[PDB]
């Protein structure tokens, strides 16, 4: 596990009310949500390195990011 | 808001094997994360608006998750 769990229980409930206004979210439901999030971003922070390195750099930048997505087909 | 922060982020990156970072990253990261969620939740929403669940369950999440 890796980010303190108060938001996005805050940031989540924010967009959660942005879609179907009074949808509430069950205990343990949102639990799951963070677990995917981390694996996904770690899943991307490994990839975005690859950009950097094909570019033969090291401090990764937006460059690498946006790039990784348009290639995954995630644009944007 | 996107009030989530940078040390969480460096911890993340290195686990991804990131060796170094730029500062720009940190906002970019929040911004894209956003897109991730509000994607998947608008998707996970439905499985529960479809199953007519009041408060949204975990099982419908994995479904929203079987999808890219």
């Amino acid at each position: 596990l890796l980010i303190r769990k108060l938001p996005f229980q805050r940031l989540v409930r924010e967009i959660a009310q942005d879609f179907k206004t009074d949808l509430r979210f069950q205990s343990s439901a949102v639990m799951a949500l963070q677990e995917a999030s981390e694996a996904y971003l770690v899943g991307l922070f490994e990839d975005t390195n690859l950009c950097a390195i094909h570019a033969k750099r090291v401090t990764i930048m937006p460059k690498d990011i946006q790039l990784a997505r348009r290639i995954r087909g995630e644009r944007a | 808001i996107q009030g989530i922060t940078k040390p969480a982020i460096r911890r993340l990156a290195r686990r991804g094997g990131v060796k170094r970072i730029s500062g720009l990253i940190y906002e970019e990261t929040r911004g894209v994360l956003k897109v991730f969620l509000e994607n998947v939740i608008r998707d996970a929403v439905t499985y529960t608006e479809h199953a007519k669940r009041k408060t949204v369950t975990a099982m419908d999440v994995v479904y929203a998750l079987k999808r890219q």
Partner: peptide, 23 residues
């Protein structure tokens, strides 16, 4: 008659980790 060898609890995030595959 042993074993269907298996133990874990909330290994419904074991499954999570594996559709992203990590470690």
């Amino acid at each position: 008659f042993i074993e269907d060898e298996g133990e874990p609890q909330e290994e419904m995030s074991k499954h999570i980790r594996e559709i992203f595959g990590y470690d």
